Design a protein around this ligand. Sequence first.
Ligand SMILES: Nc1ncnc2c1ncn2[C@@H]1O[C@H](COP(=O)(O)OP(=O)(O)O)[C@@H](O)[C@H]1O
Ligand SMILES: Nc1ncnc2c1ncn2[C@@H]1O[C@H](COP(=O)(O)OP(=O)(O)O)[C@@H](O)[C@H]1O
Ligand SMILES: N[C@@H](CCC(=O)O)C(=O)O
Ligand SMILES: [Mg+2]
Ligand SMILES: [Mg+2]
Ligand SMILES: [Mg+2]
Ligand SMILES: [Mg+2]
Lengths: 443, 443
Amino acid sequence: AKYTREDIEKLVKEENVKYIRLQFTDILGTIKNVEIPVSQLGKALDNKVMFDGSSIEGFVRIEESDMYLYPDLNTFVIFPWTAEKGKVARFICDIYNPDGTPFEGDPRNNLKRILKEMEDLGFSDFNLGPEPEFFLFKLDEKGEPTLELNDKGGYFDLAPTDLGENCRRDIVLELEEMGFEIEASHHEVAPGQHEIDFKYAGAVRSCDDIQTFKLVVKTIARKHGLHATFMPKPLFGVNGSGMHCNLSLFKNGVNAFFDENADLQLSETAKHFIAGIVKHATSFTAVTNPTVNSYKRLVPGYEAPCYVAWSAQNRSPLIRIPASRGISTRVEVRSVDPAANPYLALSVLLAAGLDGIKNKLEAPAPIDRNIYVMSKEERMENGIVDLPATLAEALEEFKSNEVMVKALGEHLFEHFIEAKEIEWDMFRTQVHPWEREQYMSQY
Amino acid sequence: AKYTREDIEKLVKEENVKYIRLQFTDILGTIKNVEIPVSQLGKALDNKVMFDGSSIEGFVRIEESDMYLYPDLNTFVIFPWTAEKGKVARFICDIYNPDGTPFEGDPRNNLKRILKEMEDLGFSDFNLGPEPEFFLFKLDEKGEPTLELNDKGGYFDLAPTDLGENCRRDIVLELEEMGFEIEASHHEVAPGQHEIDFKYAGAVRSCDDIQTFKLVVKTIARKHGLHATFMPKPLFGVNGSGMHCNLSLFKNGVNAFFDENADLQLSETAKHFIAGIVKHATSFTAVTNPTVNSYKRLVPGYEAPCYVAWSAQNRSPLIRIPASRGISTRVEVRSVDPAANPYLALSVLLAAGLDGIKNKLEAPAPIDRNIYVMSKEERMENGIVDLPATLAEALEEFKSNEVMVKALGEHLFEHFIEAKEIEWDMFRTQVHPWEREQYMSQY
Ligand SMILES: Nc1ncnc2c1ncn2[C@@H]1O[C@H](COP(=O)(O)OP(=O)(O)O)[C@@H](O)[C@H]1O
Ligand SMILES: Nc1ncnc2c1ncn2[C@@H]1O[C@H](COP(=O)(O)OP(=O)(O)O)[C@@H](O)[C@H]1O
Ligand SMILES: N[C@@H](CCC(=O)O)C(=O)O
Ligand SMILES: [Mg+2]
Ligand SMILES: [Mg+2]
Ligand SMILES: [Mg+2]
Ligand SMILES: [Mg+2]
């Protein structure tokens, strides 16, 4: 819909595009990209460009399998940042096997398929409002990220005034030319920590503005002599950077979670959906939380989720439901972090949503009383189960779950476990400066 | 054709050329040149320019011998980089003895002399689609290369973002203006390592294209305060730059390798061509990888062609056949590194393919099973040899080969070895820090 191949080949001629960055996204969620000169647009829009597909596998690839790049014309974007010989153009593309089939291991197809299956139960959209938090660090002469922050502000503070840096201001001003839709942005809890929340949109267009985001950020910050990072827990002792995820289901252009009469204004749809997120939470974390590091943030203390349960408005509840109902009816999942793969976070979250409406799952009693406060005893009296505390735990959990391990397929899943099992392997064989300074002299 | 003498004389007035590089390659692929004021354009065009042809031998030159420079008007080009007075231009020249005979020593001639052979056998064009890789290092105070890589990218990543340096993108753009037809380009397996892939072209059109590239690269990389090097493996235990060579024998303007009526769709020629490439493989490695360092890359692990054979998809096969087909039926030779002299690379690759064709050689069992994953004797099961492991080894083989020699000719072969038996000597007589690190206290 959004664009047509005639609008494009006209626009590239108009704007003077001279470079085409045909971007995609590997499995760890990194921003892959094979770039061609503009002279090579025809071949591109024909869906002919071949690139080594084994890349989608990341550092755990072995042999090269040629694959094709099918661009999505409704993702075209002309970067503000000029090159000395014209401007640069982007194109988000799906990966296809050599023959004709889509490559099953492509996180973007994988979300189309699970989304296909969403409409197999009759729902129209699956909309997303992400609240992705990031940090700004200074740089030394050498282009080397230090560990000093661009400021010393706190929650909702006035970040660097409009006379200077304001990386966040200028970051948001550059995205809006780009035809973005940002809700608002505020300084977050820790010095140097910032946030830019998004106006919600269908999953796919959402998981694509979630990548684009990260890129314009790491771009714009660099420009001002900074380093920007979505690492969940950069600095021990300070706030972590979590990327919440406001989720809503539509049917027939209408929000399904809302129900005037029923309890809380939540239909059996909204109610059942929940129950499955809860069943499957502990499991699917290993995806919404890919790294060794995240679990340093998911340590009780800094208003991070550490417990499976949902509230009216609790301290740090794992599943909130924001004040607003009706159409803005939404379930907040506040445990995802900007290291998550957006395609594989929405593929899996979508999963436990439909696994709960399918088998009509019984939403358990919502804990309204401070979940932290409870001793380590009454913690069980309400069946409030903690989450996995180390990437390993998270992976044995998910490794087992029949449902999660279907919402990824046999390719996407089998690989993932390996990269992460390698990753963990590196963390646990390592000897950090801690071990050494806690042990060398005491023992 | 491309350019009549009348044609060129036009553009050098109009475009205000004030300098001219009569450019040619020495025996080791180094780009040489004798430069002249534009005031001296008539003299070169009339082929009367004399220079010392002994320079072609490199460092192994002894006696000073006068020689002639004949430019290929089809290689005229202006460089999009102006000097204080005017522009600078150039030609790729062929070298002739004081009596209008070609110099048996010029690498560009010996590729003509060997492409001639292809016509005696009955073919029309021998196409080439190089995939040359390269590293960018930082520059210290003095303007000297350091060991700092230009970025931290990885396989098919978004290499430097479009905001800041971006050497890669800037080299793709620049080369577009220079009538260069670039296919694509990505970020390569190691940090600071890059690839820019070529559209297939005749042998010598491409080799002219491969040299010029190296020049443009180093030239722009310098401009961004970087150091672009084409070293097969400038860093131990870091992936090394290579340069696969996609080859495809044409006849009657048609890909003589395709044929739905054969195994895997490979004409009886494609089969024969592979037969001879394999016959000669251990022998021509002393030329496609012409440095004491080339072989510190041919160590198993960081993905490289240690072993000899041809399959559908494997960890790093010597010969490959990409998905693509039809006119796009080619024989990728994955062991060539960017250390090879184009004209002498092809001289030996061509010969082998022609020895297989001409001599109805039979292509062996394409080892479709992964080879890396086999033991020295479990690998001996099949007819699988690794290549030379030192330049010493690679040269003794090369010499003992009748066809290879007859593929470079008296002069080249002679000087080539001479020079290469010196490098080994310089290197086996050296005493490296490793040797000290290891033995000085051990013993
Ligand atoms: N139906 C929905 N689905 C997903 N996200 C939503 C939905 N409605 C709102 N959001 C998200 O909630 C945040 C604010 O939305 P808004 O509708 O203004 O909430 P409120 O009614 O509480 O003011 C945004 O970050 C947005 O992305
Ligand atoms: N006929 C040919 N002979 C030699 N090399 C070729 C030929 N056709 C393509 N190549 C090379 O193979 C590489 C892969 O290109 P690709 O886009 O897959 O080709 P195609 O679209 O023709 O199948 C390129 O770097 C290109 O230079
Ligand atoms: N020379 C390496 C290059 C690595 C790469 O480009 O993937 C190879 O032959 O595989
Ligand atoms: Mg927040
Ligand atoms: Mg919030
Ligand atoms: Mg490559
Ligand atoms: Mg290749």
